[PDB]
Amino acid sequence: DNVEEGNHLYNAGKYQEALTFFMKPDAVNNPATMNRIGYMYDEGQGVKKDPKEAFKWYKKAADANLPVAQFNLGLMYQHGTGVSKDINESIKWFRKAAEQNDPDAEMKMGYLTATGTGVKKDYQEAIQWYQRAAEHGDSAAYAQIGLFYTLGNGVKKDVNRAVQYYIMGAQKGDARAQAFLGKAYALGRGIQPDSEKALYWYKTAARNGNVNAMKELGSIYAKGRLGVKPDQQEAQRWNDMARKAE
């Protein structure tokens, strides 16, 4: 294959070297490869980053019914990256990509439905899209669903069930569910108050770049909440890092 070779060179950072292989007649015609050429233009892997040119390759690949590339194409409309911003053409593509079972597109559809951005707001359709994106390997989806039960958007507030969703997403690497779960342990809101497990999950979410957990952590050590020995050598570490991250 001229694409599988070009994949090996690209997988190993020889982007321009890999790009020539992809531009070969047998390679260009591959839809998955056509998508990758748009990516390389989108991030400047082998070329000077041109999003407008990246749009050309996303459209070719998305016009071949490639779920990854229909999502990418819908993004380019939504942000108006390489085309002129068309929020409502963008949902044509997310819809196609999401109904083709793309996880990222299903969640973009959970968002657009929950906010009513390009479509009639519907908290019930938004849950379905979010739960479907969870089945397809998206850990952020769990906390997005649990928010509905904590807040009460289209459902009666079931704080117990919301924390069950947080724990799921928290144990699968999601920075926010981890912070949400830490707050649940800390107040006993969702489950049984554990000052240790609350601290563990706060530390894990901060480790994963959740700013509210960093800020929370800095407050924990300074005041001396949650049974830590009050430490300011740690407390000022966290708050500085949070400021630096915004």
Can you describe this structure?
By secondary structure, the chain is mainly α. It has one domain (2-246): Tetratricopeptide repeat domain (Serine Threonine Protein Phosphatase 5, Tetratricopeptide repeat, Alpha Horseshoe), CATH 1.25.40.10. Helices cover 70% and strands 0% of the residues. It has helices spanning 2-11, 15-22, 25-28, 31-43, 51-62, 67-78, 90-99, 103-115, 123-135, 140-151, 159-170, 175-187, 195-207, 211-223, 232-244. The longest helix is centred in the first third of the chain and has 13 residues, at 31-43. It starts with a helix and ends with a helix. The relative contact order is 0.05. The PDB classes it as hydrolase. The entry lists the keywords Sel1 repeat, Structural Genomics, PSI-Biology, Midwest Center for Structural Genomics, mcsg, hydrolase. It forms a monomeric assembly. The entry is titled "Crystal structure of Sel1 repeat protein from Oxalobacter formigenes".
